[PDB]
Amino acid sequence: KKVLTLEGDLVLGGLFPVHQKGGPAEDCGPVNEHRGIQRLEAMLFALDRINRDPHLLPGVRLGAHILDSCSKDTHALEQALDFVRASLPTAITGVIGGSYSDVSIQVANLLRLFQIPQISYASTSAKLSDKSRYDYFARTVPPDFFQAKAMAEILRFFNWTYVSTVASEGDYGETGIEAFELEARARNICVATSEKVGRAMSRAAFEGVVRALLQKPSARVAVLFTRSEDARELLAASQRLNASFTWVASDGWGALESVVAGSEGAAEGAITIELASYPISDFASYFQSLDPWNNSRNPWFREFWEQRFRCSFRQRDCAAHSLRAVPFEQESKIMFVVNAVYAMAHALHNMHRALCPNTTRLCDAMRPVNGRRLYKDFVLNVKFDAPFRPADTHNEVRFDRFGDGIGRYNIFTYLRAGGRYRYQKVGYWAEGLTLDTSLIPWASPSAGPLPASRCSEPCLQNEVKSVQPGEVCCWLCIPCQPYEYRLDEFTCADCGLGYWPNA
Ligand SMILES: *[C@@H]1O[C@H](CO)[C@@H](O)[C@H](O)[C@H]1NC(C)=O
Ligand SMILES: *[C@@H]1O[C@H](CO)[C@@H](O)[C@H](O)[C@H]1NC(C)=O
Numbered sequence: 001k002k003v004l005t006l007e008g009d010l011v012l013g014g015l016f017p018v019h020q021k022g023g024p025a026e027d028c029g030p031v032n033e034h035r036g037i038q039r040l041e042a043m044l045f046a047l048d049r050i051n052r053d054p055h056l057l058p059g060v061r062l063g064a065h066i067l068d069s070c071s072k073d074t075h076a077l078e079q080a081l082d083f084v085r086a087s088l089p090t091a092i093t094g095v096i097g098g099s100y101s102d103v104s105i106q107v108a109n110l111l112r113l114f115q116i117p118q119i120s121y122a123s124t125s126a127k128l129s130d131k132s133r134y135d136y137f138a139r140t141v142p143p144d145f146f147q148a149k150a151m152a153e154i155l156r157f158f159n160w161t162y163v164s165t166v167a168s169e170g171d172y173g174e175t176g177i178e179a180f181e182l183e184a185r186a187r188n189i190c191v192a193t194s195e196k197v198g199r200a201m202s203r204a205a206f207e208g209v210v211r212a213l214l215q216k217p218s219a220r221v222a223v224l225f226t227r228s229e230d231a232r233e234l235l236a237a238s239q240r241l242n243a244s245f246t247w248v249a250s251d252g253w254g255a256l257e258s259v260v261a262g263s264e265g266a267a268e269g270a271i272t273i274e275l276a277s278y279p280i281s282d283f284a285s286y287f288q289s290l291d292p293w294n295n296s297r298n299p300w301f302r303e304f305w306e307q308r309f310r311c312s313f314r315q316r317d318c319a320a321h322s323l324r325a326v327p328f329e330q331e332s333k334i335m336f337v338v339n340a341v342y343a344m345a346h347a348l349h350n351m352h353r354a355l356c357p358n359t360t361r362l363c364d365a366m367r368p369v370n371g372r373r374l375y376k377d378f379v380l381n382v383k384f385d386a387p388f389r390p391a392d393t394h395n396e397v398r399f400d401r402f403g404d405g406i407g408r409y410n411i412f413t414y415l416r417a418g419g420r421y422r423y424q425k426v427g428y429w430a431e432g433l434t435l436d437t438s439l440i441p442w443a444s445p446s447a448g449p450l451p452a453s454r455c456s457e458p459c460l461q462n463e464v465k466s467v468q469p470g471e472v473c474c475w476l477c478i479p480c481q482p483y484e485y486r487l488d489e490f491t492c493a494d495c496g497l498g499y500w501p502n503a
């Protein structure tokens with residue numbers, strides 16, 4: 001029903017789950033205070049900032065046409081038609097949106113048809129990377145399977161070249177482990193066994209996965225690209241069978257305490273990753289100073305207020321509440337919302353430099369904006385330092401050829417405490433791997449050798465390597481004859497007579 005509108009020379013569409021799914025008779029349920037209101041307000045914060053920037057779009061004002069998805073894909077489609085009739089009211093240049101992947105999938109299916117570029121800030125489905133279906137979709141949040149590069153890198157650091165994999169049934173597990181296979185292959189890493197897990201699976205069947213993993217004793221590292229329920233039930237089975245693996249797990253496990261519910265011994269030693277975001281102070285100040293009377297531009301703020309504070313404007317018990325009151329907790333995806341808007345603004349600024357080099361004002365070269373040129377030539381080719389990034393960081397906003405966002409993950413380790421059991425940040429994956437070994441108990445005291453996960457033990461000084469043409473993880477050690485010298489790692493060479501090597 002309601003729509004948030006802002007006038008500008010160029011207008012950006014927006015799609016947010018301001019309300020939860022309706023359910024029965026109603027189309028829209030209660031307000032999403034964090035995933036809805038706070039994300040919505042991070043786009044308005046961003047638009048405000050760009051419009052005050054003397055360098056980015058100096059003479060072009062950005063407006064907005066923001067709609068509520070109601071968390072339902074069908075509802076988001078009916079609303080999204082406002083963007084397509086506008087591109088032929090007021091033309092929509094791009095759409096910043098799609099929270100849920102179901103709503104971005106359906107919206108990307110409509111927008112491609114009318115060539116409207118779209119950048120999502122929270123839609124992580126791997127399905128959205130299929131450019132034969134969603135060819136106008138790009139995103140600031142990385143696809144769930146991008147962490148496979150950070151995972152394959154963690155292995156390479158510890159020289160774990162022979163590992164086992166466990167992946168959840170579904171798009172998350174399947175595409176993630178497919179991405180891991182490829183990244184591993186590239187880093188000269190082999191997969192001993194590949195097992196599958198499902199929620200439908202019994203307590204008896206999770207033990208079958210542990211027994212499968214135990215069939216490959218040399219592969220002590222188990223790489224998980226599994227959902228929380230799967231990772232939890234796997235550790236429970238590993239626990240029951242006294243099976244000790246060196247876990248390297250995706251954000252499905254991440255730093256969650258619930259995944260390690262009564263399976264602390266099995267989990268001890270794990271390496272897990274989570275998607276990282278930094279906070280933005282300027283946003284905290286902006287949001288916390290919002291009130292129903294001063295924030296009239298957001299049509300959903302009165303309903304948000306009455307809900308959050310349990311007040312009523314009729315009962316006049318609303319004006320007594322504040323957002324400064326409680327300490328501000330910034331939602332996970334805020335940074336990506338701010339980046340999605342800025343990516344659209346940089347793409348447009350770069351296009352205006354190309355098609356409009358005589359002014360700062362908008363020309364007929366951009367009246368209207370060519371969607372195809374905007375997406376392929378400018379949106380895809382953006383590289384800018386992230387807005388509001390911390391002082392010591394070198395964070396950068398860019399996309400791959402499929403419009404997939406380049407991400408940053410934190411690396412954690414599960415350890416035995418004072419007794420108790422906790423997660424400790426051990427490193428990170430920026431555009432490369434960096435972690436402090438001194439923070440992992442199974443490396444930190446020098447005590448004990450590194451956990452092994454090789455297919456073959458190293459050859460002695462007197463032996464050459466024997467590999468199958470192509471295959472390189474597994475080898476045979478072939479001892480050079482007493483009279484033989486080693487030319488290289490794979491070749492021996494006779495010295496006839498009157499010649500011998502430095503033994
Ligand atoms: C494997 O890892 C160790 C550090 O854990 C490193 O010093 C060594 O050079 C690596 N081996 C190879 C073959 O590069
Ligand atoms: C667990 O397995 C180890 C060998 O890896 C064995 O020495 C020990 O007795 C077992 N512990 C329990 C609690 O069953």
Ligand SMILES: [Mg+2]
Pocket residue numbers: 050051052053054055056057058059060
């Ligand atoms: Mg400006």
